[PDB]
Structure formats: structure tokens, C-alpha cells
Amino acid sequence: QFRQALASEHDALYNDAASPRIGAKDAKLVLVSFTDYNCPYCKRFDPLLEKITEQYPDVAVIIKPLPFKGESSAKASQAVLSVWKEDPKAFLALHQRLMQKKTMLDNASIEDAMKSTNTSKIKLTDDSLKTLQNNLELSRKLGIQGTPATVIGDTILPGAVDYDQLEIIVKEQLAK
């Protein structure tokens, strides 16, 4: 009930237009990053996921924000998803800024991040919460109970690893 769930959730994982993507549209390997903007391990792990896409252009990353850590997690998710829907090219800078914030986010922090990334004119939509609902449903089906969690091929990486190990994992999934 795993490679079965992974197969059953293929479209939700890889083919949701409302889910932000980092890296090439023609990638041979797409990582799916279930992440939380208030999770300290996500803050550690995210820049490694991004580095992968910059170092290895055959790898892309899909971002699935989850709101597990706190209420502002849901609000931050709402912000980046709204930005992706309206201006996909503006998403990355906001995503990075929210991820590197040392403090637990709140509405002020999130509004400030959007101001300094030139995304503050983009309105937080109700429709983007439906994407957040989809991410939550998806997390349940796959048995994801914590962040970060990364789908890489036919396996799920349920925590954070260092870059050397991520390279290793990513390289053999490419070897198939």
C-alpha cells in the first residue's frame, strides 16, 4: 500500500499546475518537497533541494506547502501559492525569503517578506486554500506525518539529509 499509493497519487504529485516548481520543465527526475515555512529542518533542507536543481539541470523540485507547525504556516502557504498562480516567476524569491526567516512567522513577517520581494500587490486568494487542502489530502494518502518529506522516484525521504547524501540518492534515481 505504498508504491500503490504513489501510483494512485501520480497526478496530484506531479501534474498540479497550482503547485510551484523549481527547475527545468523537462527534468528527468522531479522531487516533490512537502515543506513547512516554520519548520527548522525545512529551513535547513530547502536550500539543498534548490542547490540540486542549480547544480544538476536534469532535476526539478515541486513545492507542496503544508501547515503543520502552526497557523502562520497556513498563511505563508497561502501567500506563495497565490504568488505562483499570478506570477510564477516571482515565487522563488518569496519562497527563499520566507524559508530563511529565523523567527516563527506571523502576518507582519509575511507581509514584510512580500513587500521586499515585490509581491505585496499580489492578493492572497481563497482559491489558493483549495491547493492547500489538496496538499493536506495528499499528505494523508502518502502517510506523511512530518516535514520535511521528499518524494524521490519510488521512495519517500522522511527527514533531512546532508548534501552529499542527497546527491547520492538523486543520482541513483536518475540511473533508472
Numbering used by the authors: 46 to 221
What text does the study give?
Like DsbC, PmScsC is a protein disulfide isomerase with a thioredoxin-fold catalytic domain, redox-active cysteines and a redox-partner membrane protein (PmScsB) that reduces the active-site cysteines. Unlike DsbC, PmScsC is trimeric rather than dimeric. The native PmScsC protomer consists of an N-terminal trimerization stem with an 11-amino-acid flexible linker connected to a C-terminal thioredoxin-fold catalytic domain harbouring a CXXC active site.
PmScsCΔN lacks the first 41 amino acids of the native PmScsC construct; its loss of disulfide isomerase activity and gain of dithiol oxidase activity has been reported previously. The crystal structure of PmScsCΔN reveals, as expected, a monomeric protein that closely resembles the catalytic domain from the full-length PmScsC protomer. Crystals of the PmScsCΔN mutant diffracted to a resolution of 2.15 Å at the Australian Synchrotron. The X-ray crystal structure of PmScsCΔN agrees with previous MALS data showing that this variant is monomeric. The crystal structure is also consistent with solution SAXS data and the low-resolution model obtained from SAXS analysis. Although the PmScsCΔN crystal structure is very similar to the structures of the catalytic domains in each of the three crystal structures of native PmScsC, unlike the native enzyme it lacks disulfide isomerase (disulfide-shuffling) activity and instead has dithiol oxidase (disulfide-forming) activity. The PmScsC catalytic domain has an acidic catalytic cysteine and an energetically unfavourable disulfide, which are also features of the archetypal but monomeric dithiol oxidase EcDsbA, so it is perhaps not surprising that the removal of the N-terminal trimerization residues leads to oxidase activity in a model assay. Moreover, the structural similarity between monomeric PmScsCΔN and the catalytic domains of native trimeric PmScsC supports the notion that it is the N-terminal stem, which defines whether the catalytic domain is monomeric or trimeric, that is the determinant of isomerase or oxidase activity. In the crystal packing, PmScsCΔN makes contact with six symmetry-related molecules, but none involve packing against the catalytic motif or the positively charged surface patch that surrounds it. In the crystal packing of the PmScsCΔN structure (which does not have the constraint of the trimerization stem), there are no contacts involving the positively charged surface patch near the catalytic motif, suggesting that packing against this site is not favoured.
